[PDB]
């Protein structure tokens, strides 16, 4: 018999049933893609693209669909806020249905390859035994991969035939699927440059086509063939797994640090954008530029877009959720319905205090209001029986200069303390916590979930590659050395 952890080894020396199980896995993955897309379309709310975007709704595969071109659905809506033009066959639901039909076709092909496994194509003509010319198969596959890479980089993303990719504002205000001109200079290696993706795919496709032709025409040496066990499928398994978790570590890194292939409007903001004050600095720069030239306060802040203030909010932080805080970000702290405004605090005699913002490491943070120079002037104290920093004796007042609260000044009650505590989380926003029966604790972004899943899978596949490389270098002792 066989152990439960060895039942898949029956197709090691069976190329036809290996193709069958690869087709079965491929069918399962395509069917998951279609079913997941249809689930996210069913649970998606496209009413508010600005204040309730897809990354706030826990959408996982919709940002990846969007990134390569599909924007509108069969329901007549588009994620950009525009009402849909003709979607053709390639909408969200159309792509999902195409994946489902592909899954069924791959299932049927898997059944055919399971039944018809003893094909003469898998038989060696020289010896009659079953064998695979793995260097030639690799050359063919590398040629096809280079052709796909070159086509995707020269026709799809450049827009000469395809739609392009998602290009957005540096602060994620305006973004859309557009054609992208390739960047062939050093700027093409800028990770946030969208032009580096078509140039990369064109050059890598050309080089992959050349290397595939080289492997098609040139046989490996005997020393390298015996050293890497090129006649064995377990060795190529180990090498392929190695390349796969290398790519998994790379995609997890680019996911966590952001890139041109990782739009903010699709995957949410970044924890480094929160820590480094990206949106906060841009908001303050816009307010300073408007106040220095013309427009005064309470009308300059009205020039601040609703989306930027939503980006400057720690509840949108991907490094703020929990491992078992499951679900959408809306289910965490409600659906955002409006921006209350910029809470500005003044002393009793008059000087602008600032609430110290919460870092990502802190589940909770003390509420302090400190001076322009950098000295603590007030706080919401824990002990409430000492010093000259409690709110009720410093006498700070919150003014607000935004949407729902534009000139409503509060000075006396504990509403000042409540607004200070809300201001330590960034821009104060109004949330509806009754539609989804929201929890209260912050959830994680799809960016954070993608990064966690891929890093965990990357280490697990490091172990898998180490085990498989062990097994393919040590085949003689894993099977038996026969008393020698």
């Amino acid at each position: 018999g066989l152990p439960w952890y060895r039942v898949h080894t029956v197709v090691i020396n069976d190329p036809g049933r290996l193709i069958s199980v690869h087709l079965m896995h491929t069918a399962l993955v395509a069917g998951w893609a279609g079913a997941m897309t249809l689930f996210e379309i069913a649970v998606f709310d496209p009413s508010d693209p600005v204040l309730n975007p897809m990354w706030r709704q826990g959408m996982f595969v919709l940002p990846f669909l969007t990134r390569l071109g599909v924007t509108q659905s069969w329901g007549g809506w588009t994620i950009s806020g525009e009402t849909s033009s003709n979607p053709g066959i390639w909408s969200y639901e159309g792509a999902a249905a195409s994946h489902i039909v592909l899954s069924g076709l791959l299932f049927l092909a898997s059944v055919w390859h399971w039944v018809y496994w003893d094909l003469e194509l898998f038989r060696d003509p020289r010896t009659g035994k079953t064998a695979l010319d793995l260097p030639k198969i690799f050359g063919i596959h590398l040629f096809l991969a280079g052709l796909l890479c070159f086509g995707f980089g020269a026709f799809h993303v450049t827009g000469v035939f395809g739609p392009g990719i998602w290009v957005s504002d540096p602060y994620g205000l305006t973004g859309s699927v557009q054609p992208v001109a390739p960047s062939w200079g050093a700027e093409g290696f800028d990770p946030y440059n969208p032009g580096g993706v078509p140039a990369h795919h064109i050059a890598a496709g050309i080089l992959g086509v050349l290397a595939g032709l080289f492997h098609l025409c040139v046989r490996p040496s005997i020393r390298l063939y015996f050293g890497l066990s090129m006649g064995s499928i377990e060795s190529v398994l180990s090498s392929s797994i190695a390349a796969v978790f290398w790519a998994a570590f790379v995609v997890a890194g680019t996911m966590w640090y952001g890139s041109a292939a990782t739009p903010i409007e699709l995957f949410g903001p970044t924890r480094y954008q929160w820590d480094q004050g990206f949106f906060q600095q841009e908001i303050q720069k816009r307010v300073a530029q408007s106040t220095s030239e013309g427009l005064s306060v309470s009308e300059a802040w009205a020039k601040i877009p609703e989306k930027l203030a939503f980006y400057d909010y720690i509840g949108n932080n991907p490094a703020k959720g929990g491992l078992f805080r499951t679900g959408a970000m809306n289910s965490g702290d409600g659906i955002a319905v409006g921006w209350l405004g910029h809470a500005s605090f003044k002393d009793q005699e008059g000087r602008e205090l600032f609430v110290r913002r919460m870092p990502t490491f802190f589940e909770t943070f003390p509420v302090v209001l400190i001076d322009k120079d950098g000295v603590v002037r007030a706080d919401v104290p824990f002990r409430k029986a000492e010093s000259k920093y409690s709110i009720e004796q410093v006498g700070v007042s919150v003014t607000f200069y935004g949407g729902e609260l534009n000139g409503l000044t509060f000075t006396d009650p504990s509403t000042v303390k409540k607004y200070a505590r809300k201001a330590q989380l960034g821009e104060i926003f109004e949330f509806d916590r009754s539609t989804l029966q929201s929890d209260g604790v912050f959830r994680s972004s799809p960016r954070g979930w993608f990064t966690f899943g891929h890093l965990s899978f990357a280490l697990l596949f490091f172990f898998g590659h180490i085990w498989h490389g062990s097994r393919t270098i040590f085949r003689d002792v894993f099977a038996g050395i026969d008393e020698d």
Binding site: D275, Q276, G277, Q280, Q284, A288, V355, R356, D373, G374
Partner: peptide, 27 residues
């Protein structure tokens, strides 16, 4: 506009800002 004021404007709320961590030798 006022790069000195906006740097001090973001000074109290957040000490990890890029605008602070760059060109901090002159301060």
């Amino acid at each position: 506009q006022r790069v000195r004021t906006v740097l001090d404007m973001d000074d109290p709320a957040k000490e990890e800002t890029v605008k602070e961590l760059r060109k901090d030798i002159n301060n």
